[PDB]
Design a protein around this ligand. Structure first.
Ligand SMILES: NC(=O)c1ccc[n+]([C@@H]2O[C@H](COP(=O)([O-])OP(=O)(O)OC[C@H]3O[C@@H](n4cnc5c(N)ncnc54)[C@H](OP(=O)(O)O)[C@@H]3O)[C@@H](O)[C@H]2O)c1
Ligand SMILES: NC(=O)c1ccc[n+]([C@@H]2O[C@H](COP(=O)([O-])OP(=O)(O)OC[C@H]3O[C@@H](n4cnc5c(N)ncnc54)[C@H](OP(=O)(O)O)[C@@H]3O)[C@@H](O)[C@H]2O)c1
Lengths: 258, 258
């Protein structure tokens, strides 16, 4: 059929390109969009149309910025009658609000579970909501979707919970290795760990260490979000310490000096 | 030659038994020791001798209790001229002080990296200090020693750092899964984690979770020690929150209840 995209950045380009290569007609509205967006669209060769025509597609995918997710849902919510797929990196609470704005359509919470830069359209996408199985039918056109949870908010929650764990582990590794570094024992500690944490441990370990530091500010903000989502369900103990570690984080051994 | 043991409890029995079966004469002093200790000694068949005769052995191993380690070193240090191997669970700084008490001998910081109970004499032991290589010669007699670090305190630090990391991950896992459970998403989070943490994750995680809950009381006490040990080297942030989780912890899904 036709799949319309709200926004046409990196995610929309990768996804649209794949769908197009499998015979799907992809459409987007370029009115008011930047030259970079207009160029990605023209590189892919998507159908240029009006906003309301985009909203008429049986599947509409919102791939804008986290800060624009609610506004896109509000503008689309007045017209979309098919399925509206929000694939933005937003919190479960924001997803539920976006869902309330889609008044006549079926809302699907999609969460990208990997790097679009490294995996392309083969990236694993999880989706939740009553209409998720309908979105998953796009797997016939080259996508890699899987249905998880039961309602909008669940897919984004799984992604947030996984990310929460991985950020906490990164913070723990940093504190552990800074102490090891003061004694000159970081390598020995890393080697004792590969004994019980796995074979490919040390590799991704150093990798996560470096990125946790480069993006300390961003990771800190992500942690405030996880603290809020967890509080709705439990009384969160770990985020507070993790945040303190990221607060501090503002040749891998060089990330350990202080 | 002759290996002397100060203290003759579970650790000493296990190691002495292995050494004896490989032809080493093992000796210890039973004066002032309890019935259970005298019994372990006679079950193994150790040579009963004077306190000073023990100190004369080329290798003297101190396997007493943490609260007795410094006193044992003070007494042995007036006599030992061979190698004094401290295998007690004391902080790295306590090990360094025990080292200063062996005034005429070489000191080796040995650290047991597993369960004596489950692995027996096959347990991996890491050892640090100038004379660590000399202690490692006992591998010829059935032990499993490996040299790490460079000076007394390094082996104990490495052990405590590994412990700090593995206990922190258990707490992070528990909190993440308990929140996931309240949303009915625990399996999804677990599958997403193995879909990213490579290794059999889901399995290595469910077991770590179970053990952490079963032994929550001991884990809590163990974390207080880790916190104190980390404090000798840095101003630790993570143990505070980790301790709060173990404070709470006192079919996998059953454990996720806060
Ligand atoms: N890239 C990744 O690896 C990745 C991974 C996981 C999740 N995500 C998520 O998926 C979403 C899209 O990511 P992305 O990298 O493609 O972003 P870009 O930020 O790469 O592209 C989004 C593009 O959305 C447009 N936009 C902003 N406001 C808009 C509005 N009111 N109406 C229509 N379009 C609007 C922009 O057009 P203009 O340029 O003209 O403003 C923009 O091109 C994000 O929410 C992000 O968190 C991305
Ligand atoms: N068991 C393990 O899996 C394990 C693992 C890692 C580290 N460690 C450490 O290694 C050491 C020994 O462990 P363990 O399990 O064998 O303990 P026990 O507690 O099994 O044995 C210690 C034995 O030391 C003796 N002792 C107490 N005060 C003494 C003194 N002043 N002089 C001489 N002997 C004295 C006792 O004699 P009495 O019975 O007469 O009191 C005692 O048998 C400890 O520091 C412990 O923390 C043990």
């Amino acid at each position: 059929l036709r799949v319309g995209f709200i926004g046409f950045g990196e995610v929309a380009q990768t996804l649209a390109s794949r769908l197009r290569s499998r015979g799907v007609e992809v459409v987007t509205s370029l009115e008011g969009r930047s030259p970079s967006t207009i160029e990605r669209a023209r590189t892919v060769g998507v159908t240029e149309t009006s906003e309301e025509d985009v909203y008429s597609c049986p599947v509409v995918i919102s791939a804008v910025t986290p800060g624009v997710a609610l506004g896109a849902a509000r503008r689309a919510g007045r017209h979309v009658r098919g399925i509206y797929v929000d694939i933005n990196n937003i919190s479960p609470e924001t997803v539920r609000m976006a869902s309330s704005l889609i008044e006549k359509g079926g809302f699907v919470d999609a969460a990208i579970m990997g790097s679009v830069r490294r995996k392309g359209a083969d990236i694993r996408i999880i989706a939740s909501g009553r209409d998720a199985e309908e979105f998953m039918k796009l797997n016939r056109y080259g996508l890699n979707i899987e249905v998880r949870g039961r309602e909008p908010g669940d897919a984004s929650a799984i992604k947030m919970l996984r990310s929460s764990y991985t950020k906490g582990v990164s913070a723990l590794l940093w504190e552990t290795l800074t102490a090891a570094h003061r004694l000159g024992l970081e390598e020995d500690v890393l080697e004792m760990l590969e004994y019980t944490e796995g074979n490919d441990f040390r590799e991704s370990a150093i990798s996560r260490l470096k990125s946790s530091c480069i993006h300390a500010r961003r990771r800190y903000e992500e942690m405030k979000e996880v603290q809020d989502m967890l509080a709705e369900v439990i009384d969160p103990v770990m985020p507070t310490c993790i945040i303190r570690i990221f607060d501090k984080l503002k040749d891998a051994r060089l990330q350990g000096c202080a």
